[model samples]
Each structure stands twice: as structure tokens, then as C-alpha cells.
Target: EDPQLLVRVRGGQLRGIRLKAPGGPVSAFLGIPFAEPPVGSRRFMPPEPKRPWSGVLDATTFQNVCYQYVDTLYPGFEGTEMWNPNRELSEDCLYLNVWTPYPRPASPTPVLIWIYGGGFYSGAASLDVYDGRFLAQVEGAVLVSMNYRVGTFGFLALPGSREAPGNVGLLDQRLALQWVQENIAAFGGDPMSVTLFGESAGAASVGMHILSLPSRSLFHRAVLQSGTPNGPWATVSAGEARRRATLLARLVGCNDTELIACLRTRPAQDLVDHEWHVLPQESIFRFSFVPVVDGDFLSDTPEALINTGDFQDLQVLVGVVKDEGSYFLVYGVPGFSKDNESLISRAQFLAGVRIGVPQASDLAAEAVVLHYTDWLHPEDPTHLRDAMSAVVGDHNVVCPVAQLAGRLAAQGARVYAYIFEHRASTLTWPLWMGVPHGYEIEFIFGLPLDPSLNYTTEERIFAQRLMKYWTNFARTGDPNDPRDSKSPQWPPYTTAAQQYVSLNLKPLEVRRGLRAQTCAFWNRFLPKLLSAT
Candidate 1:
């Protein structure tokens, strides 16, 4: 008898889980599989059910990370101990990890399923910062992390790719949730209380779930960190997708029809090595491969879908960090404009300020320049590039996120909004990347970040508060209540009053007109600029 092992659910067969004694009064089960291996012919395809084994499978080690390329996506990611611990990537990576205080089984506990973010091109649930033990033991919940397809294998839409099934990553995440719903009881979790939470691209993916048809009954609540429902930064059209597909075909020396099959069997690194950065700026989708407004899997614009009361059943919590763009600017720092004329030209080109086709483009560019130079009290030269940081952050991330939140709230869905204001003080952190994009991860995941970021002890305490708020949101719909009884009171977002709690270093404060100001400038100008082509 195998020590009276825990429950077994059909993974198409009688696969069993091996349990280890608890380090504490309660035991934990880490790194469990929620799907079959997505290797070889399975790459770029929807996840399939795992075939069960007669005996208990060892559930101790974390599995191979999904194949990916993350070097240029974020600084300090690649060539670092944190990312490439194994020194190479692999394809046999369809696995998930779980942390439960009472692993043996008992009353049901709330579940938090984390989806890691790496620009849709890369990311895994296995980051050192994303460990789930704290949430399980301290917060009294089950923490689950999953792996999914990424990059071209995840969201590529080629000519014959229609049959290849787009948005494999999103589908993979959905499948993991379904597996939990069926078998998590064995690990002592309440599947009904599962909450899907992610930051950056993962947060964006959560937003997509709120609007996806396959995700209707998947998760009840969502926590979107520094991401939005609408992918405005690199919005793309279907025609653009075809063009990119052709480029990919050329890289692999294959016709459109054979692109999917040819790439599926090719060496993952080989595909990653060739022409990865050659993305055209005019394409609707950019960054890593991402879910598009395809008529099938992802029906309409996520923001519009959510605003029409589509996700009313969902309890939503979404927010942005203080300096979301600082990380990118610092790591692959953008060069300074040579002169005023050059600055004007760059702005005109980027902001869609055209010479003849549309005068609105030029006006929009002017508005953006005005916002950065004059509208804000902070001066550019005197502030030493601080104001410019705000302009870049607002245009790229803040404004679009606010638009999504406002739309969701207007539709009668329960929506909560926030801004993470803890600035990292470190020499390596760059002069202006204030609380750069993804900086809030340390606080959200309850981990210590690099010392160069210089987050203070007080800020670290605030990180605990944030984790409490996040887990509470994951457990239930409302995040207003705090785990600490003495914590300050917060309220749901209401645009008429423009109420949003700023998650600053020491305490939370309500910033007035923050959303309205950011939204007004971007909403009016971005559309005019986007129409230039």
C-alpha cells in the first residue's frame, strides 16, 4: 500500500499523485501537471488531456520550462541566474506547480492561479520571484502556477495558420484551469474560488479571458497588474497578420500552407534565433506574439466586450505601477533627440503626425509634446527627464489601462482600480525609469527584488499589504477589505468622483483627476494619430 495516497482524477487514465510529509503541521504539493507534454507535434496546438498512470507519479521537481526566448525583452532577465538556471530551454514544458498548506486534504481552500508575463513571447510560472509557498501558508490559500505556449507558437496567425489554431497560450491557460476544477480537490483546494491573476502580458491575458468565449466559466475573479484589456500599444489588423506570416514563411523557406507544420518540428532555438526582432512597426500586433481581434477565439475588442456587461459576473482588480516604461528605457535606453527639430520629427513620426495625409496627426503630436513640456508642473530639463518619463508611461500604458477600467465600470461590472507608486531608488535602475514597468512584481508576488532597485523596508511592508489585497481579491470579488484589521480603508473606483487609491511606499492615498487627465490627452490624440495611415 502506497501510504494511503490522496485522491485520483482521470487524466484519461488513473494517474496518481505522490505526497510528501509536510514541513509544517500542514503539507504542500508543488509542481503538479495540469496537462500533457506539449512537445514535438503538439507545439503550437491546443493542450490535450494528460493520460493517467497506474502508480503515483513523482510530484516533487519543477518540470522543464516551455521553449522561449527572453533575452532582449527585459534587462537582467537572460544571462542571469534567475532566468536560465538550467542553461537551456526545452519543449516538454506543459506542467504547473501548486502550493497548499494542508496538502493531505481537508476543508476547501481558496486558489490563486498565477500567469507569468514576458511580453507574450516569453515567461513561465517558475521564476524565483513567483514562488507560491507564502500565499499558501501565510494567506491560507492554494497557490497554482501554470506554463503555456509563447511567441510564434502561441499567437502566430499565418495563412494556413487558420487551421493551426491561434491563441494557443490562452487556450493552454484555460485548460489548466479546467484541470484544477476537476482534480484540485485532491490537493485541498476549492476550485470554485479560483482566481486568475497576472502582471504585464499575463494581466493582459487575464483581461482577454474576461472577454473570451472559452473562458466564460473558467475563473470568477481577476487581478490585472500593469496591463490592459485593449492592446493599443501595438494594435494590428488581419491584413498585417498575413504580411508578418509571409515574412515568417520567408525566414523558414516554406510556403504559407507548410509554415505551421514546418515550424512545429524545427528546433525551438533555431526558430527563435532567426529574424525574431524583425517585426514591422505598422503591424497591429507587436512586442511578443499576442491575442488578436480574431473573429473566432477572441471575438471583438476586449474593452468593448467587457463594457457591454459581458464580464459582469467577474470581480475585477486592475492597476499600473508608477513608472511602467522606465525599465525598457534604461535597459535598452533610447537615444536622446539631437535637436528640437529632430525631436519634433521623431514625435511626428511616432505620434502619426503626417506631412500631408492628415493634419490631425501633427496636432496630436503637438498635444503630446505640450503635455510632456508644459501641461504638467514638472519641468523637463530641470527635472532631468522625469516629465518625459510620465509622457512615455502615459502614452504607452497608463492611459489605455484607464480607458479599459472606465469602460468596464460604466457597464455595471464591479471594477477596482489602483496605481502602484513605490519608486525604486538604485543607481542601476536608470535616472527616469521611475517605477518602471513590471516593478510591482516584487510587491505583488511577495518577493525581494534586486537591491539596485532600492525598494525600502517600509515599501517592503507595503508589499505585504499589496499581497494581502491581491489574495483577498482572488479569494473574493471585493479587494476593499484588508487582511490586516488595522489597514486603511479603501473603496471601489468611480469615475464621476474619480476615486482611486495610490499604492504608494508608506500608505495609500486617493489621487484626484489622475485618471481623467491621463485619459483626456491620450484618448483625443491617439485616435487622430492612429487614423493617419
Candidate 2:
């Protein structure tokens, strides 16, 4: 019988549920409040510790997710079902869930805290895809996922005023990390051995955490899956942040001298509802509400901080999927209307450059297209699509990640880089585009190994290795230990060779100079363009 698993946390006692697993029984402490509800006057303020609770607090079910426009449907998309959350939404959603293999282990287990990504506008810790039970049970590690504010409520900054500073969402994440430091030990987790991991915007959050001085000490290691702080979508300038906030405030009928006070009285949904109409539609990533360079949380731009050697010096494992941009194209390309029709016409490709590459001029855009074009079949529609995907992928994820890895390695930090090359058989996206963004998540969480999921033998093996490597890194800073000879050696990234592990099914191998030419062009050209502007 599964007994009541109660544990005393910083706030009070928590009653978690014991669930059966392949490895054994695991204790899931769901909907544990790490911070006080950010409601009413506390809407724009940093998260506060939860008030003490009386008696046994039941954390048996997933709590209300942070308020956002949940993606219920995407036209022409088959796998959008998993993206929607079944949990209720509310402003009081600053909750975290923990999964531990053992309620009280003989020794503390390494902890992995996950941050869900939805372009910093939408996401929840309760999504079925982010289930940590399988990962925790298989890897013998503690898995934790948390909710943070999103959209306007989470990231609005007012210029020349203290009413609203941007990045309240990031601050929520920071508070959760603080909670883990103070209380994870009670859940049979090693507080000092925590690893921060996330994908897409969440991965960018991890990178931001690495760069943020306040959050640097919270985690010892990080796994940035397909993102970095330097990515185009990561942060906005203070002017842009305030401009967006001002427009939002005006739209919500908060025109008083003290806009902050006026906004406090406005309903949460009132602010959330106006996000779509208020935000600018010019950006390629389609993200207007994102983390901004607030003077507090983000003192300077990520690139400047990195160059000054001001970021956290933690062991890092970062990588991108084989094809990250195909997902973006599925929706629509910037500056290209549906009437354009061509998969990726010459006009559309140039438009993508203008949208994605902020500082790029017409010349730079043309040069980028020329560099990525398949010279043999430049006129072919399919070739153009492929070329567009490559440029978008490189501009967005691949090159930026490589740049970050190189900078970290240059500073003598232990870094493990990888490109997830395994294309899942169960993928719903077009197969010709290769492995799409977020495809590796299921494998990373060991979902493919579950017998009920009907994963192929090859997929199962890949998932097993992924789990091993991830957990192995969590346990020790290094993914490859001397004792673990069966798994392929994941060599640390160095500046000279720029080696990176290629994660695939048949066998995982280390490869050097992934996207060498593409990165060289970006690294050399983009900064000049930005500086000139």
C-alpha cells in the first residue's frame, strides 16, 4: 500500500502521494507552494515565501497553472494536443512539484529543476509532456518543475519609474531555486548538487540564470537544450520593454498618473487578454512578452556580461536539435503572406533575415542567404525551404549555442556540447525537415522506454542512453565517469577543436566543428552589424 508521504518543508508539512513506477515506488509532491501567491498588490512584485500552513497540506494534484493563452489548436498541426494543459489557470500559480525515487534515501539524490518554455508567454509545470516520474525513477534523481508568471503580468517594465520592473517571471524562477536550496534536502535531494535544465525559452531562462549574479549560486550545473541568453528572443531593450508596457497599460484603461497603482486594480485576465492585440507583430519569433534587460535581474546585455567574464562558472551541457527552425516555418514566416505560397521564396528568405537578424542590412541578408544556399539547386522550391530552415536554425539556435559553448570553454569551464540527431518515428511534423524542435524531450525524459508508449527498440535504447548521460551528469559534474565505460565518452568542449558529441541511435559519437562555416559567418558578421547600428 502507498502510505501518506509527509515531509516538513520551510513553510510547513507537505503530504505527497506515492505512485508506482518501473524502478519502484516514487513519492510525488505536487503543487507545493514555493512562494506566496502574487495577487492583488503583489502582482508585479517579486515572489515572497509562502505563509505557514496548518496541519497536513495535501499536494496530491496539479495546481492552477500560471495565466496565459493556452494553445488549444494550431491549424494544420497534428501534435498540438500535448501542448495544451489540462490544469486550471490562475494568477496564484507560483507553485512547484517534486518527484523523488525515495522519500528518504540513505544518501541524498541529485536534483533536476525543469522550467517549461512557451516563448516566455505561455507554459506550465503540469503539462503531461513534462512529467518527471519516469525520469526520476529511471535515473535515481529528484526531478522538480515549477510555474512562473508569463505574458504582460510577468514581464512589463515602466521607464523612469519603479512601478514595474521587467522579468518578474525570471524572479519567480529565482525564488523557486532559493526554495530548493533551503528545502530540497528534506525530499531526499542534494541541495548543493542541483542541475538547472530547460528547453527553448526555458533553456534561455537557464542561460539567463547562469548569467544573472543573484541566481548563479543556486545551481551548480546547467543543461541548456536549444537556447542561450544571447539568442535573439531572449531579452528586449529597456526602451522596448517600457514601450510595450505603456501600450498594454493604455489598452487596459489604466491611464492614471501612477500606472502601477492603476494596474494593480485591474483584473489579471484584463491584462492577459490584451496581450495578443497590444504586442507588436513584426518579430519573426512572434514573442513580444519576454525577459528584458532590467537593471536588477539583468544588469547588462548577455553578450557584454559574457565578454566581461561576469557569468556563472558552472559545468555546462548545451545543444540544439537537428532542425529547430522547421517548427517556426510551420506557423508562418515574417513579412511573407500566405499568398506568397512558395515554401521559401527569395523574397521570403530576405524577409526572414530582416525579421530574425535585427541588425542585418540588405547586404548582410543577401550574404547570409548566399552562404546557406544549395548552389547545385538554388532554384528548387524544396532546396529553398531547406536553405531557409538552415538559416533560421543557425541564426536562432545553432550558432548562438556554439558561441556560448566556445566562450565558456575559452574560460576553462567544463562544457559538453551535443547535437540531437535522432529523429523519432512517432514525430507528427513533416519528416523531410528532419528532427524538429522539442523532439528530444520525450527521449530525455525516458518516455520512449515505457512499454505502454510503443517505442521502437532503437528509440528505447536511445532514450536509455540519454537518461544515463543526463543523470550521470547530475550525479557528477561530468557526464562520462571512468567507471561508466559502456556509454560513449562525452569529451569536454574546448576552444581549439570545438568538439561536440553527436547524439544518435546506432551509436553516439564525438564530432568536431559542427556548423563551423555557418558559425564563423555569424560570429564574424552579426556583431559588426549590431555595433554599426
Candidate 3:
């Protein structure tokens, strides 16, 4: 009997399964309870740590994922739908999964913990594209992913009571990282050497962890891919969070007196289902329930926080894929035609101004129209998407992220940024969509390495290169040093020189000022319009 396979931690004994990967065999401890199940009375409250379990706790099977609503169209998108939660759904979804090299390396290895992104509402570690087994085996690192509450269960903010403090989802993340600090070493991971990374909402969460002082102690380095807490969709004001919570209370026919208590009695499924009300115009970036600047987790807005110099000083790798908004066309947008151009009309274009710009004033909208429509035939619908994507993309994902990187860089935090330019050949979405959001996960997870996937030869090699860059960053603060000698030196980003690596199958090319003028329009110019108007 292999006693080593049954690892002992603070909780108890856990028997992990050994699975073969492209590189080698990996030991996976699936569904390890990191926190107590947040069910019934604990529905909206922050998760409590899972109590110790007796006997050999079964870790062979994956566990239930956080409850969320998936669109009927979710089953169609081959590129993205792979992110669906694999197991059963329930409120008791506070478990986490860990993957480590089977034999256990000679020494404790670096830890790469992932946070999944689904617009702060939908996402799970059980997603197919996020499988970290290969990432762990090939890189010889430990991979851990935790399940956090989402939707009303995670973000509902009630100011009067301690029962429903907002950003409980983030609190879940903090608790998960705390779990990593306490128990990761038993699984042959170096607790001190932890790299936190996520995509989209996950990226935003990682960025929040970067901003929040409490989480800084847990993770040493950060990789923020394609989202930041400051983005319009990523956060809502405390006032807004409260308003939505109460409105949902009224919507559910729960009397107003005991908002928290009545909400507790209602079925969990009803709370998440009734939260969505049709907006004036459906903007892909506008999500109703999201993180709030609760007094506890985050004290200020992203702009205010960065401005006041309240963030961690650490090695940060941040970047975005080209054509991020294009994905929203299919999933978030209404009647988004896949086969056709489905371009926005003249009125629709102006409406996009309101959708894209956060709290757009008349002057702000006019300025965006005048600037983005410059050097283009405004009469024709041929390229309205180009304008729309830039407007929303810059506001939501691109420019906010740049501002974050710039702010961090100004404060003496070493920052490296990039633009993912390559579209994976396996994708069947329209070519016009370009490299939409969340397209880079397949490459990062070394999915192409599986022979059955039948990825191109170039893609296989590219995945390897990405794995090297990621592992290199996790192991050492600098991405170039120790490894990546074969690739060009991915230059560091600074306030003066905004250089970043353009990632793809082609050789890693150092590019300067990604979307140079566009970021200025959103970060600098748009702010001016807001105040002036």
C-alpha cells in the first residue's frame, strides 16, 4: 500500500488519484473541502473554513460547483462553452482541487493557483479548459483551484447587517488563499512561492487581491489576464449593490422589514434567477451583481485605491487578448449574428457610446462619437463594430487594465504587460470576431499538447512556449531570467516605455504601447469629458 498517496493535512487524510498527462503522471486531490459549506443560514455570508474530517477523505471524484445560470447558447460555443462546470451544482460548493507531480519533486515546487472568470457571476474550477493537471505535470508545479460563491449568493450587499456584507465572493477567495497558506506545504508545494492568476472576472479578482491589503500576504506574484477590478462590469458602487439587493427583495415578494432574514428563507435558486431584469440596451460589459467596495474587503474604488497608493508591491504579469469584445457579440449581445457582419447602425453606434462609456454624459458621448468615428465612413455599418469594440473594450477591459499597470509601474512595482494576438486554429467562430475574450485558456493550459485534440504542430509548440513563460514567471519574478533564453527578452513595462510582448505561435515579439491612442482616449481623454461635462 502506498501510504504516501494518502497525504495528511490539518483536516485529515486525503487519498488523491494519479492520472497520466502528456508530460508525465500527476497526483490530483479533487474536491478537498477548503471551507465550510455556505448553505441555509450561511447562504449570503462569507464562507467558514471546512471543519476537520475523520478517516481517509475520498478525493478521487470532483465535487459540486457553485450554482449559476448558464445560457441555452452556452452549449454551442466550442471555444468558450468548455468552461461549464462539470459536476453537480449546489450551495455546498466550497471545495477546491489540487494537482501535483506524482512522484513529488525532490523539493517543494512553486504553486500556481488559478481563479476562473465568468463575469463575476458564472464560472467554476470544473471547467474543461481550466484543467490544471497538465500544467502541474509539465511545469512540475502544484496547481490549486477553489470554488467560490457567485451571483446573489456571492455579491449581495446589505449594509445594516453583518450577515450579508458585500464581496463575499472575494472573501471566499481570501479564505481559499488562506487555505493555501495553511495546507499547501503538505502536498509538496512551497507556500512562500505562490503565484495567483485568473482570466476575465478571475483576472479582476486577482487584481482585487493585488489591491486589497489582506490578500497580499498570501500570494507573492500575480498574473492578471484580461480583467481588472476597476473595469465597469467588474464592480458596482456600494449604494448600487444595496439597491439591487433590496429591489430583489421586493421582486421576490419578501417583505422589506427583515430583508436579510426573509431572503434567507427563500429558495436559493429563486434569488439568482430573479436578479436579471432587461436593461435599456444590453451592453456586454454591464453585469448587475458584482463586487462592491465593502468597508471590509476593499475600502475604495480602483481609481481611488491606486491614486492613494494602496496596493501590494510585487512582480505582476498583466495583458489582454486582441478583439476582446468580439466574444460578447455571441454570448451577451442580443441577436448577435454569427454568420453575418451584424454591424451596428448609426443610432446603434451612438447607443454604443452610452453602453461603452461608464456613466456617459452628453459631452462624453459626443466626444467618443467624434473621436472613434474619425477617419471612417460613419454612414456605412461596415465598421461600427470596430468603433463599438474599442469604446466598450477600452472602458471595460483594455484601458482600465492599462491604468492599473501604469499605476503599479509608477509606484515602483515591476510590471510586464502583453497583448495575445494569435487566434487558435481549432476555433470555428467567425474569422471576423478575431481573438475574442477567454480564447487564450486553451493555450495556457497546454490543451493542444493532447494528441487527440489534433492541434496544429505550431499550436503544440506555442502551448509549450506559453507554459514555459507562465512557469518561468511563477518560479522567478522575472519572466525572462532562468528560462525563456530561447525567446526574445520580454521587456519590462514602465511609465515612459510601455513595452509588452505580443504572444502567438510566431516568435515572441516585443511591441510598444498596445492600443496606444485608444487607452489615452479612455483613461485620459474620457475622464476629462466626464469632469468637463
Q: Quick one: best lDDT, which candidate?
A: 3
Once fitted onto the true fold, the runs of candidate 2 whose alpha carbons sit more than 4 angstroms away are 1-4, 72-78, 255-257, 278-281, 310-313, 334-342
Error of 3 at 105 (Å): 2.3
What is the per-residue lDDT of model 1 for residues 1-533, given as tens digits with 9 covering 90 to 100? 33323445555222223432212332444446666777777776777877776666655567777777756444453323344323236776777777766434468878888988777777878776676755665566777888887777776665235445567778888888888888777667888888888887788888877777778677788888887667453223455556655566568755544676777667777667653654653221236366656666666666457557554566788888887654443332233221221122233323322221122345665665565554353333433255445655665577777877777777666778889877644223444455767767767766532234356767656766777788778777877564454646666766676567889765667665555866786765567566763
Model 3 residue runs over 4 Å out of place are: 74-77, 255-257, 278-281, 310-312, 331-335, 481-486
In model 3, the clashing pairs are: 35-50, 36-49, 36-50
Candidate-wise lDDT, in order: 0.64, 0.80, 0.82
Task: Residues 366-475, candidate 2: write the lDDT tens digits.
Answer: 77878877788776766777777777788889988998998888875789999998888887765656887788888998888677877898898888888888888888
TM-score of each: 0.84, 0.94, 0.95
What's the lDDT for residue 225 in model 1?
84
Report clashes for each candidate as comma-separated counts. Answer: 6, 0, 3
Evaluated at residue 163, the lDDT of candidate 3 is: 76
Q: Report the Cα lDDT for residue 410, model 2.
A: 82
* TM-score ranking, high to low: 3, 2, 1
lDDT of 3 by residue, 433-499 (tens): 7887898988998999988898998899888888888888899977774733676898888888999
Mark the 10 consecutive residues where model 1 has the least summed lDDT: 336-345
